[PDB]
Symmetry: D2
Amino acid sequence: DPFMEALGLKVLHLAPGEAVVAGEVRADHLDLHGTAHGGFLYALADSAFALASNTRGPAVALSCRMDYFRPLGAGARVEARAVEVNLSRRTATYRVEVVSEGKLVALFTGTVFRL
Amino acid sequence: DPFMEALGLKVLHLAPGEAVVAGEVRADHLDLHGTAHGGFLYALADSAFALASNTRGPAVALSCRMDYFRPLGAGARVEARAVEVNLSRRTATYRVEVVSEGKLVALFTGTVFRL
Amino acid sequence: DPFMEALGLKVLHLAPGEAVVAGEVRADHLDLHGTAHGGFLYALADSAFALASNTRGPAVALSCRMDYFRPLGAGARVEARAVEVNLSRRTATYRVEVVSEGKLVALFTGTVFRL
Amino acid sequence: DPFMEALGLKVLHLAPGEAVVAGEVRADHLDLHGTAHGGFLYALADSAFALASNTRGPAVALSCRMDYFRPLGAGARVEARAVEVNLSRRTATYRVEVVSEGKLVALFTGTVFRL
Ligand SMILES: [Cl-]
Ligand SMILES: [Mg+2]
């Protein structure tokens, strides 16, 4: 995955219906506030979401939600843990918890269309 | 904005409560499908969202939704147009339309907490 | 629609990809705070959403988002105005504005899976 | 809660950061398809969401997401089980699972603004 690699993300866990992607907030991931850009944290969660969902077969995202709980400073290590919430014949939904220092710093919810 | 620059995004319009950010889907923005990664398109929309929201004063994102309508291939030019939907004293909501070739390819909805 | 009827909702306008549903905040629509229950406002928006999407053929709702901006008191007349944002072969997305006395009370965003 | 009462909903469990609300899909809860109206299921989840969040002090809902997985028929007994995902100084987020006959019917995600 080009974008994943470009962001320095690594797959730490992969299994049917699940995946964990980890990354560090680098200097090129900060925003106007000096903290982790919302797009970086989303990209992280979305990547885990893409991996987990596609273990069930080709799937494309339809709708995703991202809830942010605490701004992260440069150097933070973040992990996105994707778990399967629902698996239908044409769609599937996953929950992705974004964790840093053992606490949930963001919550991602996404649904895909199964090809 | 470091992440914005790292993704090759440019601000094309800025005004009270609004902003337009544009970018091109580069080789480092593709995903496992060979099309624009969901995180790239979100980062684009989120950047316009951040700019528009912060014209009203310091604001941080609370919850955002991204709805994807068509996968984009390498080289696509994309524009994220942010408009203010609601402005309250402690929160504000924006709609961000992602357009390519004159058509809406994604819809972003986000709410911020005003600092 | 039984639930619509039960809540006293009326279809004011219905055309390709759009619909307007109206209702009044009744005594049986209030929450403890004494204002319009979030579920009532959602039911109103969801009803317009359903009618607008049906104009394109049978479909089932997948994911919906409701953003609340202002509280409504008992007796308020309110409307849900749905418009089509995207129509694809397999899904469709609509925006629904909940309005009362000329003010935007809430914003509903929803996607359906076309059957 | 008037609206809760009107829909026949019952509070089964209420503890710090969590709540369980139960109800039955009645004749006045159906849509045209003859299945549980999306607004009824949302009202159920929203009610548990409200009760769970109130355990932390007064708060108003900002943004909520509802993901529908399975249709429910008339007479079905259903429950909304809310759990706290995040508690911050100014906001809080909850996950609410809508269950019937041991199956996950829908997933509700909501954030409140703490007063
Ligand atoms: Cl959402
Ligand atoms: Mg009644």
